[PDB]
Design a protein around this ligand. Structure first.
Ligand SMILES: C=C1/C(=C\C=C2/CCC[C@]3(C)[C@@H]([C@H](C)CCCC(C)(C)O)CC[C@@H]23)C[C@@H](O)[C@@H](OCCCO)[C@@H]1O
Length: 250
């Protein structure tokens, strides 16, 4: 059966597309405002050297902090999110921020050279730039794999914005109080996505592939948390981060 999208489901999709267009600048025009990227000579991928310099960390921490602000704005526009308590809104935002950043970065990700290309060569991020921010291959290589797997799903922007909304409104996040209300909001979004795929997505399992990405994101989130903890032990690291980043990942 291929039921048509209800008027409500159509409205949810319109709101989410509008929220994404207002919070995701595909020209990356604010990037000149971040602390500049610095690429030290590290052809050897030396952990000692990367931690000593953390040359890409101020730029990527500013990029991520800016992105977290955009994700907060997006989340606030998800139909039903404002019905949650302020406490549950913050729990969901803090636990999903890194996953939504990984999802939304797929728009700048390119399979041409396996990089996140945000305009000119200065704002092109490769595996080597992430190692220069203090992260290791145990996070970066599965993250690149995830990006390619997501790129190959060829999501319609409707499916992309619904996936990010479903990711944020997850009832199984530690510390959530009203799990039943969060689950009702998520089911409303999941049914919208399932209905959209069934009547708008041409041929040639897409919903199950999208739900598998959400599970992959949990593993990536856990690895990022372990790595962030290591990064945080580096003396003077806090100055290379931002107050928002420190709070979200602390
Ligand atoms: C962020 C965005 C972009 C890329 C994301 C990347 C590439 C560099 C390395 C990142 C930032 C990974 C790092 C492992 C995270 C490390 C973080 C610390 C704190 C250092 O532990 C996770 C996501 C990866 C660019 C652009 O798509 C932004 O979208 C355009 C902007 C519209 O708002 C988006 O949001």
């Amino acid at each position: 059966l291929r039921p048509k999208l209800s008027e409500e489901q159509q409205r949810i999709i319109a709101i989410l597309l509008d929220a994404h267009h207002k919070t995701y600048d595909p020209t990356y025009s604010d990037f000149c405002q971040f602390r500049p990227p610095v690429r030290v000579n590290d052809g050897g991928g030396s952990v000692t050297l990367e931690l000593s310099q953390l040359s890409m960390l101020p730029h990527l921490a500013d990029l991520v902090s800016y992105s977290i602000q955009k994700v907060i704005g997006f989340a606030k526009m998800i139909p039903g999110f404002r019905d949650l308590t302020s406490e549950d809104q913050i729990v969901l935002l803090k636990s999903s921020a890194i996953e939504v950043i990984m999802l939304r970065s797929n728009e700048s990700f390119t399979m041409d050279d396996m990089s996140w290309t945000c305009g000119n060569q200065d704002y092109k991020y490769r595996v080597s730039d992430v190692t220069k921010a203090g992260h290791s291959l145990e996070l970066i290589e599965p993250l690149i794999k995830f990006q390619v797997g997501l790129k190959k799903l060829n999501l319609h922007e409707e499916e992309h914005v619904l996936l990010m909304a479903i990711c944020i409104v997850s009832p199984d996040r530690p510390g959530v109080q009203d799990a039943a209300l969060i689950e009702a909001i998520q089911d409303r979004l999941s049914n919208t996505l399932q209905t959209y795929i069934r009547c708008r997505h041409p041929p040639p399992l897409l919903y199950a592939k999208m739900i598998q990405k959400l599970a992959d994101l949990r593993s990536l989130n856990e690895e990022h948390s372990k790595q962030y903890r290591c990064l945080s032990f580096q003396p003077e690291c806090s100055m290379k981060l931002t107050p928002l980043v420190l709070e979200v990942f602390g």
